[PDB]
């Protein structure tokens, strides 16, 4: 394995990851904004053979006055043939460390209700469910708008 900063040229080689229905494919403005504003929150893993196992992309925001200064996880995906290796745990730990270095307060992320495996693995990681939001996922193709779970975890500053 090899962890490095995400770059624009990698956008032409990560197609073997987004083909999973559970993963999205945002537009050019989204990726450009996330890369320019928060370059340090964009990590990609490269295999010895030249493939990409997965990537983690996030951001930080909030108000320090109300202790809302927190890190947020936007996307996190792993290739189907590179799972069961703890890569997601390593990426999450790296994001937690980099958010702690910035003096945050907590970390949060959204998740699909039906995605049972992700919820179980997050719960195993010490993450505690915060609340539930109704019809967050704007489903297309006639599918019902699935709700989302607001997932949260504390930090060490508090």
């Amino acid at each position: 394995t090899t962890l490095r900063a995400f770059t624009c040229d990698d956008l032409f080689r990560f197609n073997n990851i987004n083909l999973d229905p559970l993963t999205e494919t945002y537009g050019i403005p989204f990726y450009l904004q996330y890369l320019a504003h928060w370059p340090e929150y964009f990590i990609v893993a490269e295999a010895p053979g030249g493939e990409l196992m997965g990537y983690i992309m996030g951001k930080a925001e909030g108000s320090v006055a109300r202790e809302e200064w927190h890190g947020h996880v936007t996307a996190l995906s792993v290739a189907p043939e590179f799972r069961r290796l703890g890569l997601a745990a390593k990426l999450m730990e790296l994001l937690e460390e980099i958010s702690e270095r910035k003096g945050g307060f907590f970390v949060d992320l959204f998740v699909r209700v039906s995605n049972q495996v992700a919820v179980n693995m997050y719960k195993q990681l010490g993450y505690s469910v915060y609340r539930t939001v109704i019809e967050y996922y704007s489903a297309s193709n006639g599918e019902p708008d699935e709700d989302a779970y607001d997932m949260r975890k504390a930090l060490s500053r508090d």
Binding site: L22, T25, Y26, T74, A75, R112, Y137, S138
Partner: peptide, 5 residues
């Protein structure tokens, strides 16, 4: 994951 927007 978030919504596409």
């Amino acid at each position: 994951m978030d919504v596409f927007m």
